[PDB]
Structures are given as C-alpha cells and as structure tokens.
Amino acid sequence: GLQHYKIAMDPALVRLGSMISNRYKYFRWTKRTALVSFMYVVVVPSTIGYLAYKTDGLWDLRAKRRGDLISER
Amino acid sequence: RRATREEMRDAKVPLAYRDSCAHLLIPLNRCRYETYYLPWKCEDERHSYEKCQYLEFKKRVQKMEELREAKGGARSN
Amino acid sequence: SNRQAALSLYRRALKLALDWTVHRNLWRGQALYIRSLFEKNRNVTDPRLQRALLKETEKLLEKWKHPDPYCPPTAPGGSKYERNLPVPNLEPPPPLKF
Amino acid sequence: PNITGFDMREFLRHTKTPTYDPWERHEAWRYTGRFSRFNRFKGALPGFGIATVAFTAYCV
Amino acid sequence: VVKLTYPDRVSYPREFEGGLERELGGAGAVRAFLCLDD
Amino acid sequence: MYLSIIILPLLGSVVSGFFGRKVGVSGAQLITCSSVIITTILSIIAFFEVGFNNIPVTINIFRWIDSEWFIINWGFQYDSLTVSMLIPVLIISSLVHIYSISYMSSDPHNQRFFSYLSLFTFMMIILVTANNYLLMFVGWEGVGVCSYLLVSFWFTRIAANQSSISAFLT
Amino acid sequence: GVYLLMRSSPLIEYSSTVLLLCLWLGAITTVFSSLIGLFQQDIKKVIAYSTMSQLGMMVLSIGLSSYNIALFHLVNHAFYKALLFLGAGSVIHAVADNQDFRKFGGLISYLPLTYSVMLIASLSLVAFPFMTGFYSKDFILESAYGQFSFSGVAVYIIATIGAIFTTLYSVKVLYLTFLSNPNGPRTYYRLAIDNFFSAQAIKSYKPAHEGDFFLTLPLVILALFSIFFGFITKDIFIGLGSNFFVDNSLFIHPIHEIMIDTEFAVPVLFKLLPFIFTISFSVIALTLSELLSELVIYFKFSRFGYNIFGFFNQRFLIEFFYNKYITNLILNLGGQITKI
Amino acid sequence: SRVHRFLATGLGASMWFWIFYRAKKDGPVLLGWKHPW
Amino acid sequence: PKIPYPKHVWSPAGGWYAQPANWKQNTAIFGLVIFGITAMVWKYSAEHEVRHKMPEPDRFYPSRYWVKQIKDYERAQKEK
Amino acid sequence: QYDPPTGWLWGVRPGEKYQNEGWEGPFFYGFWGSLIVFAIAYAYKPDTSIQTWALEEARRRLEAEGILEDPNPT
Amino acid sequence: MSLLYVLLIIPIIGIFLISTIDSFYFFNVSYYKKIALITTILNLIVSLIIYILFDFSNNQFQFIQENLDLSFYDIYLGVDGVSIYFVLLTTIIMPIALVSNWNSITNNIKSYLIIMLLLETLLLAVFLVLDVLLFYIFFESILPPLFILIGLFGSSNKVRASFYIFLYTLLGSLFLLLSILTMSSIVGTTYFDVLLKSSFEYTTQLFLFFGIFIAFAVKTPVWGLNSWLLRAHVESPLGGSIVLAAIVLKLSLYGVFRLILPILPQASLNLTYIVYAIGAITVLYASFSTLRTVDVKELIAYSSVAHAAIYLMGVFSNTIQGLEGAILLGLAHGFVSSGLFICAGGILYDRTGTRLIYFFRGLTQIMPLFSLFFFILCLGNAGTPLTLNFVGEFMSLYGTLERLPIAGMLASTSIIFSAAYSIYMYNRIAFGGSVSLYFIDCFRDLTKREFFILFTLVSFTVILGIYPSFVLDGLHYNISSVVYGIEPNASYLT
Amino acid sequence: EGLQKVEVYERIKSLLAGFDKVNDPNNITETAHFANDLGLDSLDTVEVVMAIEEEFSIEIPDKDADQIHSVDKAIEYILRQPDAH
C-alpha cells in the first residue's frame, strides 16, 4: 500500500527468496528422500511415543521417603 | 568434665564437632563472637582447644597399630 | 604471476617465524636465514620449475602454521576491529509516513 | 627431499643473535640502558629492598 | 599410578557419643559413627 | 536496610538507562556509582548484623506464583552465606564502577554501559538473597541477560556477537 | 554456580554421588584450564582460563564437602582476580589497545604501579605464603589429601599439576608484559627524554603512561585485600571449630568431615609441597626465558612439541568439535526439515 | 607524576614486609617444628 | 577523536556523547527521587523484617534504631 | 568534551511538532484510561479466591491440634 | 439484558455505524477508524466491568440470561473462571490490532474494519456460549471473514494462504462435527450443564477423542499439519495476523477445557502418550526449522507452533499446575506474539517492503526504541523470567514432566531451543554489524503509534509476569473441576 | 589530531636509516625511490614494508604492498589509513 523506503534490492537475494518460496513445487519421491521422510515422520515419533507408552505411570516422586521407591510399576 | 548435650545443643555448636572435646569448643566460640573472630585475640585458649584436638587425634591413630597388624598391613580405607 | 607470489610468501615466512618465536633477538637470525633461501634460488628461470618451487614452500608455510598468528587490534581479526563502527548513512530519513 | 633448500635443523641452528645483520641500527634500541638485562630486573620486586632494611630494624 | 600407591588412612573414624542420633534427625535420618564395624 | 540493598542498584540502572539523556554522562556515573557505594556500605553493615551476631533476617514482600501446593514468594532471606557472598560482589562492583569512569571515558555509549553493570549488580543480589530456587533463578537468568548485553556491548563487531550467542545459549 | 552448590549443601550432603562428581569435575577443570592458559597469546584469555582453574578449585572443595573453604576461596579469588583483570586492563589501555603478549615487554619502567599490583595479584593466585590467596587455595589441596581416600589423593595429584602450570602462566603474563625485552613498536616506549623529533616535539611521544586517579584507585584498594584480607578472615571461614554458619547455611555432615585430619594427619612435606613446586617452577620459567630461552623455540618447532602447542592453544580442540558436531548438526537438521 | 612510583613501592614494600613478619611468627608452625600449643 | 553519528536519532540512554547543559540540575532531581523511594523501601523493610534472635544490648547493631520487630522488644524488656 | 543530547522523538524535526493521527484520544483516554480506572477499582473488589476461604478453615483445623495456638481457649 | 450479550452486540453497532454514516452525512476514511477504534474500547470497558463483578470461586456459570424460549438452536452465554481470561484477551487485543494497521490499510477501509468488528463478535461468542454445538457454530463462523480478509488485504501469496486456512480448518472441523453430533445423539443435547454430567462408554470416548483431537491438532497447529499457519499468518495483514496468532490459535486450547477433559476423561488419560509424542516431536521440529527460516514473519509465526505444543502438553497433564500454566502460556503467548508480528510485519515490513532477514542488520544504530522493545519481546519469546511467558512455560512443563517424565524432558529442551532462535533473530536484525548496506535510505525510529502498541504489549507480559496472581486467582477454583483422579485416603469420605 | 605529515616523515626517516644496505643516510628524501634513488633491490624493499607495518602497528595487504615503492607513497599510504597509531 503506502510507499516504503528505498532499498538496494539485491537480485541474487531476491531470487534466493523466490526459490525458497517456490521450492515446494519441485519436490520428488526419490530414494534418499523417502528415507528422510520416513525417518523423521514415522520412526522418530514412533520411538518417542513408544518410550512414553512404556514409562507411563512408572515413576512418582511426590513424597517418597527413604524406604519407598520412585518406581510404582 | 565432658559437656552433656543439654548445654551443648543450647550452645549451638556444629554437628561435626559434637564430641568429647567440645567442652573447650564452647568457650572458643565465645571469643570469636566477642572478639569478632580476629585471629590474634584468644590465641591462648584457642591453643588449648587445638591441643585437645591433637590428643584425641593421637588416640585415634594409635588404635590401628593393632588394627593394621590384625589385617596384616592391608588397605583399611 | 610467478614474481608477486614469491615476494608474498617471503613476508608470510618472516611473519610466521616471529609468530612462533616471540623474541625479536632470535627471529632476526631466523629472518636472515630465510633471505638466504630466497637469494639462493634467484636465478631459477624455467617456469615449470618456478611453479613447482612456489607450490612446495606453500606447504612449508602450512606445515608449520601457527595456531593463532599476530593480528593488530584494528586489523581484520584484531581485538579492536569493527568495535565502534559509525553509521554508514549520516543523512536524515526522507519524509515518509508509517 | 625438499627441492627447496630449507632444512629445519639448519633453521634451528640459525636461531641466535646474528653476528652481522642489515638491521642492528634500528633494532639495537631494544637492548639498551632502559632495557638492559640489569635495569629491566632492577625493580622486578619493587618494595623488596626497603622492606628488608625495615624488617631487620624491627628484629633488632 | 595413584591407585597402586596411595596412603592408607591415618586416624580411626571419629567416635560420636550416641551416634548423633537425635540431633542428626532421629532414626529417620542418617546418623554419625558409633561403635560400628570398621 | 535489607530491602534497600536489593532495590538501590536497580534505581541507578533505570535512571542511567532510561533517562541517561536527562542525566548525561557524569550524572549517570554519579548516580550508578553512588547507588553501588551506598549499597556496599549497607552490605558491610549487614555482614556484622547477620554474621557476627548469628541473626538471620527474613523479608517476604508479596507472593510471586500461587498455584495449589506451590507458593513462590518475592521474599528474601539473609544468612551467613548471603552476607558473605554479598561482600565480594558489592565491593568489586563498586571498584569496577569507579574503574569504568576513566576506562570507558572514550566510548560514546557511556550511559548504557553504566546502566548494564548496575543492572548486573541488581541481579547478583537477587540471586543470593532469595528465599527459594525460583526467585534465585530470576537473578540467574538476569545475570545471563546482563552478561549477554555486555559481551555484545560493541554490537557492530561480529566477533562480539558470536561470543554473546555462545554465552547466552551455553 | 559455586554458590548454588554451597546453598544447596543441606540437600547434596545426603548423596555422596554428587559430591564425588563435584570432586572430579573440579579436578579435571582446574588442570584442563591451567594447561590451556599457558599457550594463549592474548592476556585476557589467560586471565579467563585462570578464573576457570580457580573455579574448579572451588568445585573440587565442595566435593570434599568443605563448603567453608570454597566460600573462603570464592571470596579470596574475587579480590585478586579483579586486580589481575583490572591491572591488565591498564596495560591494554597504556598500549594502543593491544592484547597480544608478542608486542609487550620492558613496560615495568613505564607501568610501575601496574606491575606492582599485578605482581601482588600473581602471588596471591599462585598462593605464595602469607598472602590472601595462600590461606584459601592451599588449604583445599591439604583437604584433598586430608580426605584419606583414593579420589582425594588422586585429585591432589590432579590439582598439583594445575598448580604447576598456574605458576607458568603467571610468570608468562608477568614477564612478557613488563620484564621482557621490548617486543612492541617505538610508540609504546619512545620517551620524551630523547629528542628524536625536530618540529613535532609537542606530540607523537605517547610512551605508554600510567593511568589516572579513577583508574588506579581501585588497583590500590584491591592490592590491600590481596596482601591481608585472607589472614584477617581466616578464622571466620576456616577456623577449626568456628560457628559462623550455624543457621544451617553451610551444612556439613559428621560422617565425612576431614577438618581434623587435614590439620593433623597430613605429613609436613605434603602441606608445604605446593610452595616448593611454585618456587622451583617459577625460576625455571624465568630461566627458560631471557636466561636460556632457546629450549622453548626448539620445542615449538619439534614435530611432537608443535602438535601439543597447537592442541592446548586450540583449547583441547573442544570448540572445533562442538561446532561441527553440535551446532552445525542442529543447523543441518533444521535444513532437512525446512527443505525436505 | 612521581606519586605513582611511591604507591608502587609502598604496596611492594608493604607486601614483602608482611611475608617476613608473617614468617617470623607463623613460620615455625607450618615447618613441623613447633605445634601452636 | 569523536565518532560521527546521526543527529536525528533519539535515544533514551542519551545517544553518542550526550551530556545535557542541565545535567547537574536533573541529576539532583533524580537523586531526590531515588532517595525518596529508597526511604519508602526502608520504611517498609523496617516494619516487615522478621527475626527470631534478639541482638545483645552491648553489641553494634544499627538495625536496632529503625526495625520495629526488635525496637518494641527493647522497650518491652525495659519493664521489670 | 561531550555533546548535547539530540534526536527527533517520534521522527518530528525541531522545526515542526507531532501531528495527531486520530488514534491518540481513544487509545490514551479510552483504552489506557479505562485500564487505570479498572486498576484502582480492582483494589476494592472483594476477595473471592478459594485459598483465602480455605486458609480460614485450614487455620481452624490446625488450631484444633498442637499447631497454631488459637487466640481463644474456648 | 446480560452483559454477555452487550459484548456481542457492541461490535455490530460499529458495523452498522460504519456502513451508514455515508448516508447520514464523501466521508473521510479517518472517521471509520475512529468509530472502529472506539467500538473495541467500549467492548473492553464492559469486559473489565464483567471481570470486576466476576466471582473467582463459583461453580455455576455467571452473567447468564433467562430465555424460556426453547428453539432447536438457541444461543446461551455464560462465563466461568476458564473462559473469562480468554474473553479479556480478545477485548484487550482488538483495539491494538486496529491501531497496528491504522496507516497500512489504504483501500477497502470499511471492508477491513467491518470484518475485524465481525471477527470480534464471532471470536468472543466462542468463549461465551454454553453449548458444544454453539461452540462449533462460532469456531467455524470465522472462516468466511478470514478468507476475505486475507485475499482483500494480503501479500503476494494471499490466494494460496486464504485457500490453505479455510480448507484445513473446514476439514479438521468436519471431524470435530462428527464427534459433537455423536454426543448429541447419546445425551440428547450439548448444553454444558447437561452434557458435563454424562459419562460416555470408554470405547465411545476413544472414537470421540479422535476427530475432536484430529480437529484440534490441525488448529493447534501440531507439526506436519502446520503448513496453513506459515502461509496464512505471513500473508495476512498485520491486524488479521495479530488476531490469528493471539486469539484464533487459543480457541482449541480453550476447547480442550470444554470438549475433551470434562467428558472424555479415560480416553485423554490413555491416549496421552500419543499427544505427548506429537507435542514433543512438534517442539523439536518446530524449533529446528525456525532456526533456518529466512522470512522474519515466517520465523515469528512458526515459533508459535513451538509454544502451542508446550501448552498443548500442559493441558493433557491432568495436573492443576500444568492446566493453569497452559492457560497462562496461551495468554502470555498472545501478548508476545502480537508484539513480534508488529515488530516484523509492521515495523520492518512497512519500512522496507521485504520480509527477508538477509536485508536487515544493525538496526540498533538507527532505531534505539525498536531494539529496546524488540529485545524484551524476544526475551518473552525465549521464556525469560519477569515475563508471563516464563510462568506459563514453567508451570505447564512441570505438569508435562510430572505426567510423563520423558515427554516433559524432551519438551523441556525448548528452554534451549526457543532461546536459540529468538536471540539468533535478534542479533541478526538489531545487532551483528553497523547498519545493513542494502538500506540506501536511512530509516526513522518507532513512531508514537508504534511505541504505544508495543509498550502496552510488553507491559501486560511483564506486570502479569511479576504478579501472575491476577490471572491465577480466578483460575484456581474452576480448573479444579477438570482434573481426573482421586487419592486413596481423600475420596469417598463418610 | 591524527597523524601529520611531519610526524610520519621523521619516523620513517629514522627507520630506513637502520639498513646497512642503503647508499647513504643523506640520499633519502620525500620523493626518494626505493630502487632508482636509494640502494635496495627486489627482495630488500619488501622487508622495508614488513618493518613499516611493524612500526606503525598496521597490516599491509599483499595487493597494496606492491604499488608502494618510494618514500612518498609510503608517506601518503599511512595518511590514508586512520588506524595508524
């Protein structure tokens, strides 16, 4: 809308920003990429979720004296 | 005479120094209070308390002269 | 080409001897020894040997490089460099409403 | 080995004060009365000299 | 090197009258040295 | 005295930092250094008060975080560790404040410099005078912010910028 | 951080595990620091590395469950370390803000007050006898051996090298700045006694003068502390049975108290050993600089000595591995998520 | 300004004079000769 | 020398070499403000500083002259 | 030497003065003014929190124990 | 008449006034902005009066109005402890959002002002209705005004941004709608009082959880479902970008307090490890990417994804501390996020026309006041103490940790990573050089309008961070009703 | 207040007089060339700049170390760098 200050618009920097903005159109399912997508979308959440499942209710600190245990399961 | 706990809890001496010699610790801690802990004021009776520290220490180092030989000079620690 | 680079490595050589030996007495002996090496191969003429000779001493400068060379405080990499840089544009902003 | 005639041992052997250099007349100022081996350590322990006399006086 | 040659302790563990039982927190807390094994 | 030791360095920094236009250079130095000298005087007194007499003092101003079981207070406890720890902090801060009048006498941004070291002073007192771990963490987080702001005081130097990210993130 | 463990002492006294890690974190840190400070070419870098060695000495003492000594050393270190930083600060100001040792020397005749206060600060840091820093740090070493355990005796050894290399950097800062031959330019040293100038005698001299009132007054005040403060206050913190922290401020459990054995069980040689190792290693450092002074140059160009010079100058290469394996990896993980 | 020289020497003189004084009295004790008592 | 800088930039900490002509008059005003509320902090502290031990009458303890929780104790003990 | 303080607050040059855009009266007299007036009124709002109610009962419950010596012996 | 209906009808009077003055009197577009601004402040006045009559320890809904005119769909309004602070935050933010875009909106000013006033009524109805079908009716009613606002006043990629927000929200909501419909069939209504004393079968609770959680996961947003936010928060005008990140994101956090915790107790407890897996994955992934984001707006926008994960984990804590800190976090976040969008999308963008961090450097040399507020704002985004962000961060992390330690540990890496990108962005814009050399034209510092809306926002986040008892006091009693559990010796007393 | 013309000349004049390899101390002027006027060569002249840099505490880049071949250029090159002390 309203005019802004004069900026020394770098052609290289404005084409890097356009490439980064438009990058989603050129993605393909290649050999390495499916491994990256599988690793970070499936494996890592699955590992984090599984350890949460196996440690749920396991420990409690609330008022544990000497003679009790942190573990409850 | 040894200082019983009743006048020795009231004296507020530290836990790690709650032992036989602490009867001389109570007067030593009063000079420190009264003289602002200056290390030139009650050197006299400070030496007395430090002296009784030495004797009880010596009785606790001679007690292994039979204990160390009982273990044949082994690692007692 | 083949003349400027030779002189540049001379300064790098003397700079690196002082950088390692702090004592100005002792680098003076070292610096005098370096000048002999540059003087000894003054008459080398064949460009094939000249390029090879220059390449070898670049490794020597690398093989005994100092972990941190001296850099004057105002020099790029010095302690005082870029410390209180002034603004590039001293002129006031043009009249714009934001 | 080392087509350039640089040998580290002879580099190390030439690590001293040279008998002749093209540069003493500008470099000699560093090894002078202000910066002699004696005048530089003349005050390495600033107050040591006076205290020794004072301590002896107190002892006597 | 230190493990092979490090000195044994010099003094017996300090004896404490009553093991500092009450004033170290009672039986519910750790006590001091009193006529125990060495 | 025991709440004035805490608050006084904070006032010097606020005036030196937000009204340094009005107090100028020498006024900002006069205010910040006086607030630290006076705070030093009291913390020397508070040493004799607390330490030499074995009389700790407790001040609870108001509650910071109230949530069921947790009641965190804006509260301050002076003990033998507190007054002992306040001696080096306040004495050295006073001298460094005096040291800076002649050391940074060439740097242009001289109000911001004196406001930061008077802000660091405040945080280091907050840290050691707290009742609890969470009020101690306000001084701990604040000392990091003050150290960041002073490691990157010459913020046009990239080297000072990288060394301040390292300080704040580590 | 040292205050946090001292404050938390009532809690951490009931777990010997954290006191054992305290005792070994500090021991590793005090020697990791002294070995690095010797090879640094910036003065402020050496003083920073000395700060972390004495901070390790504080952490090691907490591991000995002697929080009174750590407080005493935390206080005594504060007074002399500032004097070292502030005294060095006047050195950088005297020269054209140079911070490299390679450009100093002979400045003792130019900075007489600065050298004297930095010498006082250096003796307290090395724990020269009867000085403020002596009463604090040297007693941690006795306490470490006083704890008649494997770890205590081990870290007495670990810290006694740290004492040796502290003396070596202490000498390097003190010698290369004031006692050495001039390594900087004419400008730092060209006094007005010699003319050397025809029509510009008014200016261009600037021969590294001393400071002004506001710059030197803290240095004189901090000097008093480094000579006397430790002696005056040694009963409050150390004592033998002092009751200063009887509000349960610094909590020590009877079970692993080592105060009585430290004053009685340690052999006389071990108590006085760091003094012997400090005089011996300081004259050698003086002897290997302006007295023999080739052996360092021989070592700096020996193939083996070249690598360990760069290993310790580059700070155990820790920063090199931190960037390419932690921060760059974090930066590349982000790149994977944004782009792929 | 000769005042700087006097403070330098004074601090050095005050320092050293203290070590001899602190060695005249406390010196025998830490050498294993005389226990404090 | 002196670094050049824009004269159009307004800073609350002052700017580049900012010393007002009235620096002393305003430093006086701010110093009174600092003293004024520091006394208020002093008044609040003296009323809510709580102790569990009473200092000895013969001992240096300047807190005794303003803090209420022991000021009343001295006069309460002055009744026998 | 030191320089006098300088700069254009809000970007208003020394020759000119700040010009109101239309949001100032509503923002200062309305939004900020209401928030201040709300603040003083909050100082008189009666306490309705579950703690101060539960502290009162809990005070009595601990009073009927060895803790918290009650003012009246009943 | 209830004060709660006064809240809803005041912005409609402003719509009527704005659209009608032209007939009453070429009216200057400045008058509509004064009408729109005055309307929002009158609304804040009623909310401040409601909060001053509010009772902090009452379980019955307050400020209700008798209807006795039962139709199939009726609008019932009520306010309790949980919903009142969300109401106050909408009323506090809307005047600032209008003043933020005072000069930037140059065309279609009636359209811009009418949509914002409509959005205020619709957003406030969400926290005020007393029915779960009413809740959905207003949660999804904001889609048309938000679609038109982005396309009319958005940036270059506005069409894609306006398509992304509507379609994701429409899709996630249709899954929430199927769950809300199943409940109405079982209970016969979704009025809160009736529906709250319903105890669904566990298997039903599981299939009710999903769909509801599918919806809220898209509107949280959680990582992997967050493409709409980066497109729509960046392309949206600054005023609409403020409303989207301060109020719109907080409808799903408040929706857990009405649709998940009180009626799906067992499913929430059993499926917590899924939520904490997504939340911890979201914290890590949303943090590493915003380190690499080169759009300054996209970087501030996507840090919200990282904070939204933190109070989403705190709302599943089943801990009174985590639940309260989650509300405090969502409340504090709407302050800091609003200010950061002003700093980036309003102050940098209006001066430079570009959002690329490449072109910015060393603005402290020219803009002292901007760096002052932008630094306190980055400290709040990093969860530094003396800021309400810290208190919400700290309390919801304790609840997350106490519920699932390992998930709370992984979530507790945001202390490192949120500071990692807040100071990295600060040191590249305000610091890190003298002044960017792409600025061939020197800038002006903060204007009075830029100074006041920022000063107000950092004021709320700081006063409430030094005394969070202002919010925590009215929040304690009502969140006590959303915890699920008993003690072995404090239950079934006789 | 900065470096002056008279300051740099007298400082540099006392420096190149430190060689034992120049023709004579009386053969140096403001416009004295390092090769034609006074006695040096290809390898000596680069040692002069590597002493000039030391005694002005600056850094001479290799690209600018070649144009400097006379005393006059040395005088003016110093005045162009404000970092000289």
Ligand SMILES: *P(=O)(O)OCC(C)(C)[C@H](O)C(=O)NCCC(=O)NCCSC(=O)CCCCCCCCCCCCC
């Ligand atoms: P002037 O003498 O400037 O004339 C130079 C001329 C034009 C003669 C050229 O040098 C030339 O044409 N020479 C012949 C061909 C050539 O290009 N030679 C270049 C010189 S080779 C040389 O000097 C070999 C030895 C280099 C130095 C080895 C040691 C490096 C330093 C090691 C430091 C280790 C740590 C202190």
